């Protein structure tokens, strides 16, 4: 379990370790290293998704490690509440950025191992705090340079709690 402690409340996340093993390991390496501390939800599109895991306040892009291959051929769809990895047009380019689908986004789903079809890999789901997600998705936004859809008031992941102990989200 992973909890994002944001200034709009907690987002509690259950990872799909067996279905996205390398993606979950990469995510938990960034968590362990404090990478997500003081990062923002820098791209917020109501009716679509909210995206973070790349930038600190001031839109400063944090240094990342080597990218991961795309695990999206795992049968998991981009349904409301899922977390998936952001990436460039190259399928195997994801690093630390992720997004939370606020509605089912079928057009993001894997259809084939091709440049056009690989889609976006789901690796976790929100098990508590969708009300927080739904608050974030509605905030006022603007442009900040090459970035559109940037919240006017920063939505900040202040810290991240990773727990391995037993939990009740079963």
UniProtKB/Swiss-Prot annotation:
Keywords, sorted A to Z: Cytoplasm, Isomerase, Rotamase
Residue ranges annotated for the PPIase cyclophilin-type domain, each copy included: 1-162
Recorded GO CC terms: cytosol
EC number(s) given by UniProt: 5.2.1.8
GO molecular function: peptidyl-prolyl cis-trans isomerase activity
InterPro entries: Cyclophilin-like_dom_sf, Cyclophilin-type_PPIase, Cyclophilin-type_PPIase_CS, Cyclophilin-type_PPIase_dom, E_coli_cyclophilin_A-like
SUPFAM superfamilies the UniProt entry points to: Cyclophilin-like
Activity regulation behaviour: Inhibition by cyclosporin A with a Ki of 25 to 50 mu-mol, a concentration 1000-fold higher than that required for eukaryotic PPIases.
Predominant subcellular localization, coarse grouping: cytoplasm
Subcellular location: Cytoplasm
A GO biological process held by the record: chaperone-mediated protein folding
Catalytic activity: [protein]-peptidylproline (omega=180) = [protein]-peptidylproline (omega=0)
Similarity section: Belongs to the cyclophilin-type PPIase family.
Task of the protein: PPIases accelerate the folding of proteins. It catalyzes the cis-trans isomerization of proline imidic peptide bonds in oligopeptides.
Protein name per Swiss-Prot or TrEMBL: Peptidyl-prolyl cis-trans isomerase B
């Amino acid at each position: 379990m992973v909890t994002f402690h944001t200034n709009h409340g907690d987002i509690v996340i259950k990872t799909f370790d067996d279905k996205a093993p390398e993606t979950v390991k990469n995510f938990l390496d960034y968590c362990r290293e404090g990478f997500y501390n003081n990062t923002i939800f820098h791209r917020v599109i109501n009716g679509f998704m909210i995206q973070g895991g790349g930038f600190e306040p001031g839109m400063k892009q944090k240094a990342t490690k080597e990218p991961i291959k795309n695990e999206a051929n795992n049968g998991l769809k981009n349904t409301r509440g899922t977390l998936a990895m952001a990436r460039t047009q190259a399928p195997h380019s994801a690093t630390a950025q992720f997004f939370i689908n606020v509605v089912d986004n079928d057009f993001l789903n894997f259809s084939g191992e091709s440049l056009q079809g690989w889609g976006y890999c789901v690796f976790a789901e929100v098990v508590d705090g969708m009300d927080v997600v739904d608050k974030i998705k509605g905030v006022a936004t603007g442009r900040s340079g090459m970035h559109q859809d940037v919240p006017k008031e920063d939505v900040i992941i202040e810290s991240v709690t990773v727990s391995e102990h037993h939990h009740h989200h079963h």
